[PDB]
Design a protein around this nucleic acid. Structure first.
Ligand SMILES: [Mg+2]
Ligand SMILES: [Zn+2]
Ligand SMILES: [Zn+2]
Lengths: 62, 49, 133, 113, 32, 39, 67, 137, 506, 147, 263
RNA sequence: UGCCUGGUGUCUUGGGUGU
């Protein structure tokens, strides 16, 4: 049931590399992540995300 | 504030009178309904106690 | 080739309101009763009172998009110091021998008074004026 | 809220070509060039360089809207010359001018250092 | 000493190669 | 209070500027009024 | 609130000249002479230091919320 | 102190210069030739004190059309500044604080007692009056 | 409150801004508003591919869609659908797609005094959060960009879209039935720049002419021959303006009985869309009747007339951008030779008023029939003072050079008039409250700084100074009284006029 | 401070603004047409006085009903090497060519008002309705409709 | 054919005269130096603790404006063009700041000298905040009183001034040509006489004033340009000029490559 | 195999914004 929803994530590629966000929408292959840095929400592919875990940053295998 | 209200309005209460010199601001007043009815004390004015 | 030719002596030069434009009034030396009122650009062709100007009017410069002239080609304008191109917006067939031709070179106005015989051929849509000094 | 990203002024999308050329058939030997993610810096340089070539009879450019980073240029040469060759010659000539300018500035700076 | 203590003729020698009433010197605490 | 160094410096500058203004503005006004009188 | 890092108009860095400006004013130099001594030529830069009001000295007087 | 009813019976001078008897820029004082002589009883402390708190911010209010003075008096109460120095410890429904307030370069003497120098509500911008690109019409 | 007028759906509201680079009948719509509003488009075999693309894009990507409506009326929300790509569209369904370019929308500003306050524009989606208008339409809306807001209403049907595009469209509303004259004309700095650009001594080089010609959308690709061919090719501003005018337009106007040689460059003569002489200003491209806009609308139709605004605005705006125009404090100043004339005129008027006062006080004053002695005296004094202000203002105006910026703005008709020059430079004049001079609010005097029974001009509200020179405290107070009267009169008459118009409409 | 309210129409970068010979670009450009009809001469006088004050390091005294005249400020401005009326020769940002008209130029005190567009923009397709009348509710905060 | 003549030279500003170039080329060079020369500036701030009276984003904005040495920024890569997951040492520079006030009296000033470079590209002279001298404390960042601490970690990236003004290497580029107005490119507003009402240009002595009897020359073009380049210290003046020229060359070469590959 | 949510008072009053 979209386990990565409402989880802190970091962007590793594209024009937003290294920005912390929170996943809001998880329909599929296109995740809506709100950014902490500006006040906006952007779409992003799943391959571009690094989901936070108990041990550092983990790629899209959470 | 001048409690004359809106009903039965007239231009004379809203006008800036000669005797207002030095006691209320000639420039500062709201816009619309309360124009002229709301006044601001001049910068050296006082009220007797 | 050329539709009119004469030599004029400048009577008056009026700058007036403007800085780059002058009104000059001239009468033909060979024939009085021919007048020329003209707007000119001061900065390019400055004139003074009592100057002598050779004025020529032609309907073509030969011997539609405008192009910068190549240095190799030659045209009628090679012999003159000031060439303008304008449209004739009035041909007053006036009294017995009083004919007025009004020409506007993009807002710079010219009026040519003269007899019918001299200005008969000037009934064209567009005219070049060629001034030499 | 509706403000676009600032990097869109110079970062080119993959599907958008940097340079699209379409002929202008109203007059002979004329082309219309659409530059993407460019502004007056390149446009004015190219225009004033091309205006001096004897074989270029019309060159102009315009920026349609300040809020979009692109400009469109109209070029029209003589019968002998293809316009794209004239554009390439202009680019190469400006590059050589900049190169000699850099060399001379370096020489002067070393002298006055 | 200061410019005032200078001789008037020597003050005349000080020529630029007067205060105005509407140029105040800035403050930070104001008053009231 | 134990005011900071910047605040103390600002207070000294303010006192000096107040004195200088009170002197110079008054002098300039006195210079101008006599000229306006004699005209 | 606190001296801006860059001049708004042109972009010269004026944030490192506040302390020097106050030191110069302390010694009796006039404001124009103090600004000239710091090499602030354009009046766009001069208005940044001349018209700055230092409010952080008032915010710091409140007791810190943590310890 | 005089009130609005005692003012009916007094003769006031506008400035201390009025107590005693060809430039294209300076203004013109009233001639007052109807009276052979005057016996003033009071003098105004300063005429610019007839203005209120909001109208004491305008510089050169006597060079302006009066409706513009009224509009500025209205709009000066909507300018974001620093309303108080303890805005951190206050819980207001709304609060707007300007990052870098600056005091005006052209100030008035009445701004000293309104603390406008210490809690200003604006900035000095380099303004150019021009028809540049048609986007400021 | 609920039947004659009610709140409605499918509408938006935000601040308006100006855009010189928009056609006359175009409005700039923010992206967020375009995403929020929608238009239900019926799926047919001409647009099923495009509509499927829109459905795939979803409600967050532009162009996109918000809902899919089946034949039975059920709504499929695309936010909460996990299988949006697994939706196939059948003919007859509706897709509530996003607002797109060239969609007709009704645009409105309150109060809606006349029918030109609601007009239909074409949508153009733009960044940032303000509605954007071509500045020629700011006149019918009575709108400016100091904070005004305007309303947008989206049609929701093919019939309603056709009605908006065929009846309320902006090009169809250029000429009004109220006074059979255009309601939209060239305004503000475009008017000022078309006056400056069409002066007799404005010449343009080849490289600038090429740029100016490329800016005209309707240009046919042929450069006109320059007015001056030798020694240097130069074009005049009239040529570049005539480039923007459609061919086949004839316009003739006589200003002050000028001859066909037009020594002062006044009047007008446009032959086959080419300007022969005459400076183009408010009398030609303004909103008055019989001008260029009215002629083009009658001759060529609403579409060409709408394109005329864009052509003229683009050319003039480019020229004025690369030429410049400003105004300064030096433009409100008159030399000493004129200031002494103004002072002498004002002193003479004050002496005349003093003589009238003496004559009235010694019963030597003639009485105007139907008016008392006091009324006749007051009328004569008011007339004398008004004539004084007019004379001083005329002297100041005649002083001004051609390069004066205020004079240029007044001459173009873009902004200001003669009274503004008079008051800024020469004399503010007499302040009238309720049609009379300043009354005696105190006991037999206007202020406690005057002696009793003083009828001198300065004692009853005659501001002798100018705005540049500055007002004395008494003049300041009297002028404030007059301004307060103006504000009150406006704020009171507006309600009476609104009631009258409502009764008339009912 | 003279009733000259307005809204931002567009933002240009540093290199697109007109600049003076010494590299100063304005923070803000206003139309000349704002002045003549409204007759806010105090705006121009304040700009001139502020220019002189920032050049000389003083604060101008703009108290009303004083003896300050425009000619004194102009003399002070001329003594500092600027045009006495405040004009400046200014260059075009796009092409670098001089502008044919000189530009009035100087610092002025501006203030930011509470009315921002992002607090006023509002749109509605469908949403809550009143219980009594089943018409759209009133208010931007409540996702209401327009009347 | 183009010529360069340097009038004054310094580490932070150079005053030079260009000649035998078109006005468009000089203006394009000025624009490129203003807004297209890449530099290095702080672009992400991770605030681990901030108990000062300033807001977190206030301090972040202040940090972004601090100039950093960008001498070897050419070797560095753009963040969006680096294939590395997260940020590596080849596309970012990590600086760390830690400030604290000890004692129950006094105020501590936090300067840009306290920014300590932690990681960055190997042997590249980038990232260090610019200092006027060895004893210059730098830009004032914040102020602290007792028990107030600021502990942040900042990441610097490469960018241009088009994206944000913090990446601009220049402050103000004075630009000027034709001091005596022989080309009549401007028309002088005046009240009595235009000659004595307008101040002379600072380069008026570098060109001969027109003769009283001289006629207007319609064949002349602007030929000599006087321009002064001031920098913020991140790049030297000569580096700014040379890199602006190189950036313009790269842009033109890219256009040429696009044209040649279009066919 | 553990499986995802749309539902928002009312009435007064005040202060404002654009005409
Ligand atoms: Mg408005
Ligand atoms: Zn600066
Ligand atoms: Zn990397």
């Amino acid at each position: 049931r979209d386990p990565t929803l409402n989880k802190t994530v970091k962007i590793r590629q594209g024009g937003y590399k290294g920005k912390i966000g929170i996943v809001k929408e998880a329909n599929g292959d296109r995740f809506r992540v709100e950014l902490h840095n500006p006040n906006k929400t952007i779409p992003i592919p799943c391959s571009f995300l690094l989901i936070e875990s108990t041990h550092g940053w983990v790629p899209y295998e959470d | 504030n001048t409690p004359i209200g809106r009903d039965g309005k007239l231009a004379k209460p809203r006008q800036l009178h000669n005797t207002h010199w030095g006691l209320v601001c000639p420039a500062e007043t709201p816009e619309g309904q309360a124009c002229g009815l709301v006044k601001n004390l001049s910068l050296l004015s006082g009220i007797s106690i | 080739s050329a539709l009119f030719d004469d030599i004029f002596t400048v009577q008056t030069v009026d700058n007036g309101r403007y800085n780059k434009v002058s009104r000059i009034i001239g009468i033909s030396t060979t024939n009085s009763a021919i007048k020329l009122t003209l707007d000119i650009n001061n900065e390019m062709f400055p004139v003074s009172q009592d100057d002598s100007l050779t004025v020529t009017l032609a309907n073509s410069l030969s011997l539609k998009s405008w192009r910068p002239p190549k240095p190799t080609d030659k045209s009628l304008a090679d012999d003159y110091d000031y060439v303008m191109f304008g449209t004739v917006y009035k041909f007053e067939e006036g009294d017995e021998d009083k004919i007025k031709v009004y020409v506007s070179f993009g807002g710079l106005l010219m009026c040519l008074e003269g007899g019918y015989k001299s200005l008969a051929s000037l009934k064209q849509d567009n005219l070049y004026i060629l001034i030499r000094r | 809220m509706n403000a676009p990203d600032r990097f869109e002024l110079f970062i080119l999308p993959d599907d958008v070509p940097k340079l699209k050329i379409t002929p202008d058939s109203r007059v002979p030997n004329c082309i219309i060039i659409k530059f993407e993610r460019e502004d007056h810096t390149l446009a004015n340089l190219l225009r004033e360089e091309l205006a001096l070539y004897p074989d270029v009879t019309f060159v102009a450019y315009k920026v349609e809207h300040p809020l979009f980073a692109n400009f469109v240029m109209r070029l029209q040469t003589e019968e002998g010359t293809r316009p794209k060759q004239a554009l390439e010659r202009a680019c190469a000539s400006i590059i050589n001018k900049l190169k000699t300018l850099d060399h001379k500035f370096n020489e002067e700076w070393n002298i006055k250092n | 000493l200061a410019i005032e203590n200078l001789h008037p003729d020597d003050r005349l020698l000080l020529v630029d190669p007067s205060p105005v009433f509407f140029l105040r010197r800035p403050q930070y605490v104001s008053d009231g | 209070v134990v005011a900071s160094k910047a605040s103390s410096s600002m207070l000294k500058i303010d006192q000096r500027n107040k004195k200088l203004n009170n002197r110079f503005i008054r002098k300039a006004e006195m210079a101008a009024v006599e000229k306006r009188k004699l005209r | 609130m606190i001296i801006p890092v860059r001049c708004f108009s042109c972009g010269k860095v004026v944030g490192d000249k506040w302390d020097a400006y106050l030191r110069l004013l302390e010694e009796g130099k006039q404001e124009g002479d103090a600004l000239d001594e710091l090499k602030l030529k354009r009046y766009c830069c001069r208005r940044m230091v001349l018209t700055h009001v230092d409010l952080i000295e008032k915010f710091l007087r409140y007791n810190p919320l943590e310890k | 102190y005089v009130d609005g009813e005692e003012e009916e019976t007094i003769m006031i001078a506008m400035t201390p210069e009025d107590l005693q008897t060809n430039d294209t820029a300076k203004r013109i004082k009233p001639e007052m030739s109807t009276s052979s002589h005057h016996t003033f009883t009071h003098c105004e402390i300063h005429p610019s004190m007839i203005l209120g708190v909001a109208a004491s911010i305008i510089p050169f209010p006597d060079h302006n059309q009066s409706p513009r003075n009224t509009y500025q008096s209205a709009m000066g109460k909507q300018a974001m500044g620093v309303f108080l120095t303890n805005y951190n410890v206050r819980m207001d429904t709304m609060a707007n604080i300007l990052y870098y307030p600056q005091k005006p370069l052209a100030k008035t003497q009445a701004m000293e007692y309104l603390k406008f120098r210490e809690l200003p509500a604006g900035q000095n911008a380099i303004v150019a009056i021009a028809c540049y690109s048609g986007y400021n019409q | 409150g609920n039947l004659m007028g009610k709140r409605v759906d499918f509408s938006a509201r935000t601040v308006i801004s100006g855009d010189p680079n928009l056609e006359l009948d175009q409005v700039g719509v923010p992206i967020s508003i375009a995403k929020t509003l929608s238009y239900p488009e019926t799926v047919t075999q001409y647009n099923i591919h495009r509509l499927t693309e829109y459905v795939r894009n979803g409600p967050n990507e532009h162009p996109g869609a918000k809902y899919v409506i089946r034949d039975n009326g059920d709504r499929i929300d695309l936010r909460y659908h996990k299988r949006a790509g697994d939706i196939v569209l059948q003919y007859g369904w509706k897709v509530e797609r996003h607002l797109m370019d060239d969609d007709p929308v009704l645009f409105n500003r309150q109060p809606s005094l006349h029918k030109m306050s609601m007009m239909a524009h074409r949508v153009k989606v733009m960044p940032y959060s303000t509605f954007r208008l071509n500045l020629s339409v700011t006149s019918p809306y009575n709108a400016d960009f100091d904070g005004d807001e305007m309303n947008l209403h989206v049609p929701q049907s093919e019939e309603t879209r056709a009605e908006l595009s065929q009846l309320c469209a902006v090009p169809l509303q250029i000429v009004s039935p109220q006074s059979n004259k255009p309601v939209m004309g060239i305004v503000q700095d475009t008017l000022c720049g078309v006056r400056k650009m069409t002066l007799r001594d404005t010449f343009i080089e080849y490289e600038q002419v090429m740029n100016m010609l490329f800016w005209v959308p309707s240009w046919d690709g042929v450069v006109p021959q320059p007015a001056i061919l030798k020694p240097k090719p130069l074009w005049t501003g009239k040529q570049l303006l005539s480039i923007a005018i459609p061919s086949g337009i004839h316009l003739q106007r006589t200003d002050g009985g000028n001859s066909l040689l037009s020594p002062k460059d006044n009047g007008m003569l446009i032959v086959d869309g080419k300007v022969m002489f005459g400076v183009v200003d408010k009398k030609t491209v303004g909103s008055g009747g019989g001008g260029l806009i009215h002629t083009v609308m009658r001759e060529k139709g609403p579409k060409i007339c709408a394109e005329l605004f864009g052509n003229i605005q683009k050319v003039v705006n480019y020229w004025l951008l690369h030429n410049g125009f400003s105004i300064g404090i030096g433009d409100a100043i008159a030399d000493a030779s004129t200031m002494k004339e103004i002072t002498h005129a004002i002193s003479s008027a004050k002496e005349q008023v003093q003589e009238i006062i003496y004559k009235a006080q010694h019963n030597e004053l003639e009485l105007k029939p139907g008016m008392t002695l006091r009324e006749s005296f007051e009328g004569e004094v008011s007339r004398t003072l008004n004539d004084a202000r007019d004379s001083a203002g005329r002297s100041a105006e005649m002083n001004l050079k051609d390069l004066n910026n205020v004079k240029q703005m007044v001459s173009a008709g873009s902004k200001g008039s003669f009274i503004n020059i008079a008051q800024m430079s020469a004399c503010v004049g007499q302040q009238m409250v309720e049609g009379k001079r300043i009354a005696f609010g105190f006991a037999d005097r206007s202020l406690p700084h005057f002696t009793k029974d003083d009828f001198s001009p300065e004692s009853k509200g005659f501001v002798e100074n100018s705005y540049l020179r500055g007002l004395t405290p008494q003049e300041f107070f009297f002028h404030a009284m007059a301004g307060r009267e103006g504000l009150i009169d406006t704020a009171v008459k507006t309600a009476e006029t609104g009631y009258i118009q409502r009764r008339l409409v009912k | 401070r003279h009733g000259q309210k307005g809204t931002i129409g567009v933002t240009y970068r540093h290199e697109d603004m007109p600049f003076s010979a010494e590299g100063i670009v304005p923070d803000l450009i206003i139309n000349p047409h704002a002045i003549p009809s409204r007759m806010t001469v105090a705006h121009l006088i304040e700009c001139l006085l502020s220019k002189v004050g920032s050049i000389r390091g003083y604060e101008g005294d703009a108290t009303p009903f004083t003896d300050l005249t425009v000619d004194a400020v102009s003399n002070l401005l001329r003594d500092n090497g600027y045009q006495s009326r405040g004009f400046e020769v200014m260059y075009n940002g796009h092409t670098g060519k001089k502008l044919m008209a000189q530009v009035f130029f100087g610092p002025t005190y501006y203030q930011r008002l509470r009315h921002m567009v992002d607090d006023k923009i509002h749109a509605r397709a469908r949403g809550p309705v009143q219980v009594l009348t089943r018409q759209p509710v009133e208010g931007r905060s409540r996702d209401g409709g327009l009347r | 054919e183009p010529k360069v003549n340097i009038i004054n030279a310094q580490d932070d500003e150079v005053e030079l005269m260009l000649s035998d170039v078109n006005l468009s080329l000089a203006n394009s060079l000025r624009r490129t130096m203003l807004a297209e020369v890449p530099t290095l500036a702080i672009d992400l701030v991770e605030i681990k603790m901030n108990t000062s009276v300033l807001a977190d984003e206030f301090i972040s904005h202040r940090l972004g404006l601090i100039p950093l040495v960008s001498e070897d920024v050419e070797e560095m890569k753009y963040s969006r063009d680096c294939t590395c997951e997260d940020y590596c040492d080849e596309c970012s520079v990590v600086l760390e700041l830690s400030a604290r006030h000890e004692g129950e009296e006094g105020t501590t000033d936090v300067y840009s000298s306290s920014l300590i470079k932690v990681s960055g590209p190997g042997n590249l002279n980038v990232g260090e905040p610019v200092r006027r001298d060895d004893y210059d404390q730098g830009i004032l960042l914040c102020k602290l009183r007792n028990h107030q601490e600021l502990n942040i970690r900042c990441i610097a990236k490469k960018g241009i001034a088009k994206e944000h003004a913090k990446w601009s290497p220049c402050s103000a580029i004075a630009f000027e040509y034709d001091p005596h107005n022989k080309l009549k490119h401007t028309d002088f507003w005046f009240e009595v006489d235009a000659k004595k009402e307008w101040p002379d240009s600072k380069y008026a002595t570098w060109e001969e004033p027109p003769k009283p009897g001289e006629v207007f020359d319609y064949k002349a073009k602007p030929n000599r340009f006087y321009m002064t380049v001031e920098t913020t210290g991140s790049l030297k003046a000569n580096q700014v000029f040379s890199r602006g020229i190189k950036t313009l060359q790269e842009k033109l070469a890219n256009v040429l490559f696009e044209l040649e590959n279009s066919r």
